[PDB]
């Protein structure tokens, strides 16, 4: 099996409508991935090999592991902290390239050539089926995460009860010790006056 | 205040292609809903009013509550293996009717009069956007539960650390008490020797 990530993007040439990007890989995005773009009517598909990823990461002076982290933020929709990414696609040449905006820099991150799919309806139906499967998967993870929260709250409740009983036993013992010291002081007086 | 449910269905006339049924309503399903059917290329939409739902329950001689329960299982994917529902759609008439299947028989539960949407791509894009909105909301619900789980683990660690500190103090106090009772044993014996 593999892993996917379906994301919304807005093309620079078409800011009015929303496009959808589907990226799928095997174990890591670093070993290559298939990328599919659709507008709800047509679909375009491309493949990026591991060699192309290592080469594009080398055309720019950039550690390869760090470059994959930029692909994940750009193509897998993980760039929340005030990052600006742009996506460009010509439906006449099928050339897709994306850039990263900093301070009017807009430097190129990567690019690939897509191809118009002859069965867009089947690709779109497959995309909707994964979203529905991902919704059912994520609903069970909500219930499991809520159950883990209640299990931890009961473990915290037990830990607080045990700490309170621990304090109670410490109080009793230092009271016992202080009372024994008074008995010792009394017996030392009994010994002192028996002489 | 609108709710929505998107389900995978298979039409009787097209078993090899998966269709999608989008049901949206406002207050309750009983008060009327909107149907959208798509195959990834085309889209058909229609509306069912509260009066038509009540009329369909009357046509089947059952109380509206039990009929709406059947609507919920057939149209909102609220059915298990004990309930089987089939779906029929003719692209020429745009007439959609669904049935319940028991043993070797089937009977009508309801129907919609759909119409082909002239801009299905916008309908399909809006449907996918909703699924991605729902995925993001469930993602935050996991992160909120995981965070509340971490908050409970921090309270436990503090209580465990506090208890362990008091546990070592208890042992120190117990050793002090045992030392005092040993002196208490010696002094009580020397007291009896001074008495004798």
UniProtKB/Swiss-Prot annotation, chain B:
Changing residue 72 to E: Abolished interaction with NHEJ1/XLF. Changing residue 27 to E: Abolished interaction with NHEJ1/XLF. Changing residue 44 to R: In SSMED; impairs the protein function in DNA double-strand break repair. Changing residue 103 to E: Abolished interaction with NHEJ1/XLF. Widely expressed. The modification Phosphoserine is found at residue 54. Belongs to the XRCC4-XLF family. XRCC4 subfamily. It is linked to Short stature, microcephaly, and endocrine dysfunction: A disease characterized by short stature and microcephaly apparent at birth, progressive postnatal growth failure, and endocrine dysfunction. In affected adults endocrine features include hypergonadotropic hypogonadism, multinodular goiter, and diabetes mellitus. Variable features observed in some patients are progressive ataxia, and lymphopenia or borderline leukopenia. This is DNA repair protein XRCC4. The lineage of its organism: Eukaryota, Metazoa, Chordata, Craniata, Vertebrata.
